[PDB]
């Protein structure tokens, strides 16, 4: 449902611009970080979309060009794929699964090499895809860390506080290509999306969605990822996605986006639309109470799953008897 | 395939005694105490009959009149069914299930109302069926505590010292009628089945064959029962159990069984054959080792689920719970 720039600009984007799926979705609501509604949702743990914060507004200038100037000669991690859709795998978890190959690989480099290879396959029709993810740091040049300084660390700061999280734990700025999707997964950190350049649009599941959605398994490289190929869905083996409802929106320069922990995030940069730009903020969650509320919380249910897969991995000594062990144990018993 | 007793009195049972069913067996072991063979059975935790023990010799000349003389006025369990099939409830347990009610009650009672009872029973033609089950204890009289006494504690102290269990827990007179059935279930402990009057049929199944026995949840009353029943098996709901194999053998008076713990057993008292009197021991089994290895034995991952299982319950708050929980974080992911 399209906002039009100020200037009479026109609208930032169009529908043709989306994907389409299969499921519905509603709007997350946008809001005002006056508005005491964004702090109830926020405390709460759902999403909201946060208009005028400025946290990151000295960030607003930065494209290529000026990045390129003035980021530094450090190594930034470039992924790669064929396809619009991106797989992120745990290098360390590759052990686990012999049956296994790569296929949306890691690549170090500078930024002037993604720089021409971004614009090289523009030059070529390609479908071949980059997404640069790399934690900011110490090693970006001066008019950066000046930059970085400016961001609005009063608020950020003091909604850490009031909400009780833990410490900062990451920083990413992320550099992504038109079309670009980063399929559904959930993160076990608290997220402010801070939207610099360029439109991503952003599907939310919540954390009782999670039969919906099969996760691969807590072993697999792929923890944390949907199975599901959005795309083409398989109803056979995941028949309950065929009741899954999202909430949506889009997000454009200035924009906040509060992802709460647990909740599942698929993020596409619009087709046509350009490069996109964005900064992350993640944070530890608050601890869990000492005054144990019964039913538990969907997160809470999910943290215990993924802990006795893990545990299960540990006590059986290898990860490949865990199914084996998780099936027998619930078939003809618990169905 | 049947023993014939000393003084040519002919063979003691014969098939036609025997419940038919759908699986296939093979012999335990017939061996003598003294054999090497039998030690090396027991130290590995696999069933044998010692014909020789003498372990209760002075309980060889129990019967129903001898022990109404000489037991005393204790309350004696004992359970009750109105088919030969018998279901032991966990009385504890009863708090969970709601939509639930006995169908195999224990009443408390004296000796002498419990053999008139039976014999009451016998002289109408009664499918209801009685099964004495009850602790030996100190409130027995004089000539019973004498009897006792005269078991064969140097061979099983022996036996508890050579295999590193623990403290002996609990010994059990059960008095059964004719036609009574124990279902197919396993115990935590490891145990002497003392055989003493009368005939007993035990179909055994190794823990390495739980997925095909399908015992109830760990929190439902019946924990640690199949819930096939052997009569009229469901294959809809429990198609593994047409992969079953058992080991079988009848015990007599002076047979000993080493049941070794969390074996499956189904005990049956031979049709037409009488009163059967037997004496178990139950023992604490070993500490596990410091020295861990894998993969884990069959025995070890039943542990591990009951104790998944019994977490989960306290987890969640409820034990209804646990099932879909289970379901949900095993469908799509791990099948
Ligand atoms: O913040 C995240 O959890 C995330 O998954 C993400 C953030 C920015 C772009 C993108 O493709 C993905
Ligand atoms: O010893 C046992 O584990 C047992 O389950 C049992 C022992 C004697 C008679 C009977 O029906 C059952
Ligand atoms: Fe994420
Ligand atoms: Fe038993």
Redesign the interface.
Known sequence: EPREEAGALGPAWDESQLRSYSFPTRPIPRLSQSDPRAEELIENEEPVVLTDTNLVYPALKWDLEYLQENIGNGDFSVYSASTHKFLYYDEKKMANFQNFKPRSNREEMKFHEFVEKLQDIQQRGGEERLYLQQTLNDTVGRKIVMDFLGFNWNWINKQQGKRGWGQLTSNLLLIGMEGNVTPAHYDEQQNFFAQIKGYKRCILFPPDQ??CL????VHHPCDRQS?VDFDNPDYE??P?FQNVVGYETVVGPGDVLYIPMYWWHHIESLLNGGITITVNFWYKGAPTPKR?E???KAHQ?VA??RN??KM?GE????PQ???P???????????
Request: glycine fraction near 8%; avoid cysteine.
């Open positions: 999670f039969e099969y996760p691969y398994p199975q083996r995941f309950n144990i019964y039913p538990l249910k215990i799953m006795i897969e299960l006590a059986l000594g290898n008897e865990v199914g062990l998780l099936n027998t144990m619930i078939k003809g018993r618990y169905n």
